[PDB]
Amino acid sequence: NKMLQKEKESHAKEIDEREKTIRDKGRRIYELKKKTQELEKFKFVLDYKI
Amino acid sequence: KKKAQDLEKFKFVLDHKIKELKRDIVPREDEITKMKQETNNMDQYLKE
Secondary structure, three states, rough: HHHHHHHHHOOOHHHHHHHHHHHHHHHHHHHHHHHHHHHHHHHHHHHHHO | OHHHHHHHHHHHHOOHHHHHHHHHHHOOOOOOOOOOHHHHHHHHHHHH
């Protein structure tokens, strides 16, 4: 018991932080999706104006 | 990010020809011109 108590620990904070990183990278994914979408329409708009 | 990069120039540049075509038109419509002065002066010649 004493040796196993010395042994056992961890990885819950790591699970949560990895979920946090998933969250942040999904945030950036959608931000860049919106930026790309904003820039896409202007291409056809400017071709049409030309 | 790369798609937005490949689309930022598409959002900006063609404004270049947007301005260019109008600027070219600028001197183009202009020639409502000396042909009319000729028609006026030859009309004066007709008068006399």
